[PDB]
Design a protein around this ligand. Structure first.
Ligand code: CEZ
Ligand code: CEZ
Ligand code: CL
Ligand code: CL
Lengths: 785, 785
């Protein structure tokens, strides 16, 4: 079974085998953890760069998680073994590593915690994980109850494998003074500069108990012996051996021996995490490891999540949609803008898009993000490929490979901020540039960005692509310096048209004319060179080849140039229906719209690395949700209400059982992708990546707020412009907007020919609520034909 | 049990649990594999840089093996499951992953193969692995026999897990045309230049059968199901499901169904390895996958190993020593010089030392190695930190961090070559330098190297250490440009004294004087600044601190400055006994001599990274065999015969049972280290690193040939100078030397006061056999007091 519980606070799966990849996530200001339903977990923290405290059993690469991450028996996880001392029978919570028969299983994804209930052998177990807001530590609460009528003698063994920490130096031992296990290493390196750089690393891992145990074991191999994780030798014997690790793989295993009366329950607390030294571990222990410490952290964390609850609560005829939107969407949006994906150098397009989502949650964060991003703009007007969030950080990985699209996001996402807040006064703030002495207003910086986009075009008037655009791995179209992007061109026309509208609102009329003319020039170039007759191509290679066209067998159509041609005006009214039909025919699937099709099955080396991905995975033809929601937004922009909703709703798994089993995910987030290549590889199509990091969700939230429910800001007030699916006879929403609350009731009427709006029971004229007082509540009734 | 079998060809362990880390190795011109006794394996190949075809289940770091490498259930390996179709009972060969009760177990390390015999359920299994000489492929032969009296219906399942190949693209499927499983990936990258660089990668892994199977499975998770590796679901059912992998972790599993008569045995052949494409896999199949192909490869491989058999066979009163020296030592030496550790940029000290070993095996390889190494000498005289073996290769890892000792090895190892071969004519060969147009003789290059060592000294006359010397991770003594090395100084005096002796043999008298004077100057500086009263210090830091002294609590004495002071002449007759005693008191252990003591337990940042290793591991205080044999060689140089032999013999595990169990290794190689820190951490002391890559063995072979058995070359012929341990009443050796064979019999006599030598039964005068005819055999009798 799989359903919402606890009044929306949690979401419960009752089989540990039906959906074995399913998972949920938690984060805080400094860490994140992905927890699998069977007890595997991946945890990363910042110090200030990424690191981990629970390691693989081998020397793993520097990485967090892969899409569709597979687990294996020794993957890091969070386990508790229970042993009936009378019978010798054992089981483990949550399910791994023993995989015993259980009488009851629940995995509960929470807004603020992750928990399990299980039962075996008549013993009832509860496990609850949460994090505090500001420190790196896991708070673990275990409850064990004898559910039967006679006393029961049990051994209870936390098993938190530390893994292979380092080939230079790893060890571990029990510390009575810390009250638990302290594993220790030295992170490997070779260069002297790295010794200086690594000085403040938290290269100890602690596992501390509140209640002193009977015994412990710190050596992984001693724990397993021949019995392995299925039946550890250390657990077969009466008492753990109390061994240490001396350049041996360390582990964290404790043992409690209890005789529990009928119906008796006992609670045990632990914390797990990294530390510089034992002193820091003890500081965490004193702050957190108690009933009071756990309750204070929980109260503070629930407060943090509620601070990010957002501006929209809905009550539609679709209860799965209600649950997702009300309870899960805003937390996922909030994570992205609040901690910027836990990177010290966010990709600029990610920083600006994730902060755009924040406009609906905590817009002062958005405001400061624009100020920060623009302070790092180059004097040319160009934006850097990443934005540094800490002095001393550097551009890493894809951010060192030249992509050309960074400036497009500025006005595209500023428009959401300005519409929601009406904070045009941001445009007057003064900020520096990345180099030089010039300090200019936001508005001037934006003009220089749009001038950059206009200058970074070839003689045909089309945008250079270099080693990629929005599609990060699209690296061989323009690497010789001549290739151009179809998508970047259409999106630059959109950006320029939006920014000209701002300039016109600001009385910057010369600018408005200049950018409007820019946008027409690009659109005309696009129509001349990129349009392929039934859809827009994707780009022109360094050697002059148009691709993403009907002559290409793989990558015959890409979604992005279509959505963005719709938004930026390259697609007129006669080309629009060609796009809709071609997308439906070639890209739509039951799991959502694919970003390109057919997927590439081999390298095409004038397009590049994207074509080497497995067909259907990631940018190579998946249902890549971020591209899908750009299409949904383009659809809303032209009033294609039914098609917009249909494709948005496809992003949420369930309630169809086959759908839920095939995507394999709990419906508590939208992943970066569901597997595509639907025609080529049907068996796997729909499978969830399980990756909760995705720019999709800022845009999905915007589409629902402003487009489907149609409650959008303007300089006059709240614009009522709903695009509800026709199946809905009635719906309600509660919209928070500029400090006020709107209780909106939507109802279909066959008495009217045109929408009618009532505010506090009086019919209004027009579609705008203009008189908004902070702290007030308004009743809005919207009757629709 | 653990013993030599097959007339020395193999070495057999009969418990899969007593020595669970034990392992043996195979190599060829392009690959190596370390095979664990329970069925785990690590395999690397060159194309021309390192790569693998069997992956971990996660995204592993670029690495081969760690010292004391731990395994875990999903580590790569080489397995076969047997299922009794009547009972459903299963077991796996060799032992993992099921770990069933077996009725018989043998793991056979071979000179040219690795094999197992096991039995369970009345079924007798044989497994044999070997490699061809020149292609990258594993040749696997499986035999299954019903050892009982009634027919038996069995399913037989090879299980060769491919692992997690790539996050960009991984897959696999069955190919009837190839006749087996083909897994495929694209190695991840981001930079366009890497696409060009990676073009010829063998990114397919094949598992091909000679005999067509009943069924197959390519998806790892489908193979395991809930049952895991202990009881795979695919094996529970009647027939494998014939599944593929589509961006899922692939595997190689086949199934044969057989009804075997009483006493019936069947043979099945497979090959496993990497390929560019199916065409290459089929080429390997046609060449190898047959009884004829396996026999041709085996015959060619045994020939290759016999070509490396070396120059010394011994018959001593110690049968463990005999076995090791005769059967295992020469193959380990041969590996090092023949394939240079499978790196395209060997560390210069490793290249020169490993090639020195070759002087006793195939000296033309040694000769060409000096020619190659010196062609890359810098015009200054300095040697580079590595030697490039392929055009386009680069210096990697430690070779990019400046170390100062590279030139010292030239005359130290040239001396062995000249003594063995008498090829002074090498000195006349003309070779270029790394830059510039100068082409000079070997002799001139050597003079420039020794002038470099003399110039690279401070005002005190001591050698700069920069970021390290022989001790690779000794990186913080001289990183600011002032620190100097105690060891490098004493070894430079040795190098100069040897090279002056060559110059004197070559009538280069000015050079002889110049370098002899250099050596005295350095030795005097060493005695003034480095000698600490009872032993020589290790170095002086940038801030002027002498370390490796009696005032240091950790790192109180280092072995190297003592051995090298003995060799180079810094240690006179009055200081020698102080060194011997201090080494005995502080560094000697039952497992061999430690390289420093007490081990460092925390960073000391004017010594550096070495001090951060776990105490007792690697350079931080292990029994680091390469340093140990430098001491043994220094001992032989002063006639400390008993102490030399004792410490050399300590390098060979066994026959003491406790010793064999504690080191945990088969006695078929000498590892780079046995764990030290004997006083600080007794529990783990002696544990083998299991690393067969080590420069130790060229020197151990030289010590036995020239020092213990005392059969050493000179410009006059064969010098007889034995240092046998006194316990030996008699011994024999067979020495191959300059094309002739010497059958040497050694016998102790109380009738003589001084050694007597007879050649073909006539007493000779002096200690040199001067008349050596190629192809002849001589009988030498050496009577000792
Ligand atoms: O090859 C790769 O590493 C990966 O495919 C990344 O490019 C990708 O990264 C995303 O790829 C999007 C589409 O290319 C891009 O618009 C976002 O800015 C970037 O965060 C992943 O979602 C990161 O999890
Ligand atoms: O920190 C490290 O990576 C390792 O300790 C290496 O330095 C070491 O490498 C050896 O270390 C020796 C002593 O330092 C050195 O003389 C040899 O040239 C070098 O091959 C290993 O034996 C490679 O397996
Ligand atoms: Cl795209
Ligand atoms: Cl040393």
């Amino acid at each position: 079974g799989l359903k919402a519980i606890n009044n929306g606070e949690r979401y419960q799966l009752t089989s540990p085998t039906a959906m074995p990849q399913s998972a949920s996530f938690l984060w805080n200001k400094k860490m994140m953890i992905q927890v699998n339903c069977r007890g595997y977990a991946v945890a990363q923290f910042m110090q200030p760069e990424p690191a981990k405290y629970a390691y693989a059993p081998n020397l793993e690469a520097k990485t967090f998680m892969q899409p569709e991450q597979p687990y294996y028996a020794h993957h890091p996880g969070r386990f508790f073994y229970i042993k009936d001392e009378e019978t010798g029978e054992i089981f483990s919570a949550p399910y791994e590593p023993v995989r015993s028969q259980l009488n009851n299983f629940s995995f509960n994804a929470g807004k603020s915690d992750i928990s399990w209930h299980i039962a075996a052998l008549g013993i009832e177990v509860e496990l609850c994980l949460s994090l505090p807001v500001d420190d790196v530590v896991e708070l673990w609460e275990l409850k064990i109850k004898n559910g039967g009528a006679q006393p029961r003698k049990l051994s209870i063994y936390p098993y938190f494998p530390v893994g292979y920490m380092s080939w230079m130096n790893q060890s571990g031992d029990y510390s009575q003074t810390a009250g638990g296990i302290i594993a220790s290493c030295v992170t490997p390196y070779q260069k002297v500069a790295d010794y200086f750089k690594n000085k403040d690393f938290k290269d100890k891992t602690f596992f501390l108990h509140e209640t002193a145990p009977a015994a412990w074991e710190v050596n992984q191999k001693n724990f397993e012996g021949e019995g392995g994780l299925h039946n550890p030798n250390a657990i077969q014997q009466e008492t753990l051996g109390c061994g240490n690790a001396l350049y041996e793989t360390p582990t964290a295993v404790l043992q409690y021996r209890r005789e529990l009366a009928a119906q008796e329950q006992q609670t045990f607390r632990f914390i797990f995490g990294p530390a510089f030294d034992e002193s820091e571990a003890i500081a965490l222990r004193n702050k957190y490891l108690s009933a009071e410490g756990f309750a204070k952290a929980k109260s503070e964390y629930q407060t943090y999540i509620t601070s990010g609850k957002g501006c929209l609560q809905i009550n539609t005829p679709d209860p799965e949609l209600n649950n997702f939107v009300n309870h899960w969407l805003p937390r996922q949006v909030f994570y992205h803008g609040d901690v910027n994906r836990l990177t010290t150098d966010p990709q600029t397009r990610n920083y600006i898009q994730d902060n755009m989502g924040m406009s609906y949650i905590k817009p002062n964060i958005t405001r400061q993000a624009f100020l920060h991003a623009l302070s790092q703009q180059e004097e040319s007007g160009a934006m850097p490929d990443g934005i540094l969030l800490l002095e001393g950080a550097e551009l890493k990985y894809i951010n060192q490979i030249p992509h050309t699209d960074h400036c497009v996001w500025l006005p595209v996402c500023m428009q959401a901020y300005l519409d929601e807040t009406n904070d045009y006064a941001l445009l007057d703030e003064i900020v520096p540039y990345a180099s030089g002495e010039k300090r200019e207003t936001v508005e001037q910086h934006m003009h220089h960005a749009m001038r950059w986009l206009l200058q970074a075009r070839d003689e045909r008037g089309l945008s250079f692509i270099a080693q990629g655009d929005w599609c990060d791995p699209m690296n061989m179209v323009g690497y010789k310096g001549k290739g151009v992007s179809g998508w970047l061109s259409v999106a630059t026309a959109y950006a320029l048209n939006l920014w000209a509208d701002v300039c016109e609102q600001r009385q910057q009329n010369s600018c408005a004319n200049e950018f409007r003319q820019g946008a027409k020039d690009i659109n005309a170039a696009v129509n001349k060179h990129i349009w392929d007759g039934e859809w827009f191509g994707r780009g022109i290679t360094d050697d002059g080849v148009l691709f993403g066209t009907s002559k290409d067998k793989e990558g015959r159509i890409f979604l992005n140039p279509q959505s963005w041609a719709i938004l930026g005006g390259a697609a007129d009214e006669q080309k629009i229906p060609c796009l809709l039909d071609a997308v439906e025919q070639q890209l739509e699937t039951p799991y959502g719209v694919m970003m390109l099709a057919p997927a590439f099955t081999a390298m095409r080396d004038d397009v590049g690395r994207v074509t080497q991905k497995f067909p259907g995975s990631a940018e190579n033809g998946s249902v890549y949700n971020h591209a899908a929601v750009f299409y949904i937004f383009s659809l809303l922009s032209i009033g294609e209400s039914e098609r917009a909703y249909k494709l948005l709703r496809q992003m949420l798994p369930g309630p169809d059982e086959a759908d839920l089993l095939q995507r394999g995910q709990l419906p508590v987030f939208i992943p970066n992708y569901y597997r595509g290549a639907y025609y080529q590889h049907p068996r796997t199509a729909g499978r969830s990546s399980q990756l909760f990091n995705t720019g999709t969700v800022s845009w999905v939230y915007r589409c629902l707020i402003e487009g489907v429910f149609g409650l959008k800001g303007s300089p006059q007030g709240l614009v009522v412009q709903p695009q509800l699916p026709v199946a809905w006879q009635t719906a309600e929403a509660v919209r928070e907007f500029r400090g006020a609350t709107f209780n909106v009731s939507y109802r279909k009427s066959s008495d009217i020919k045109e929408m009618e709006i009532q505010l506090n029971e009086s019919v209004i004229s027009g579609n705008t609520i203009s008189d908004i007082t902070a702290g007030a509540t308004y009743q809005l009734t919207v009757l629709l034909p």
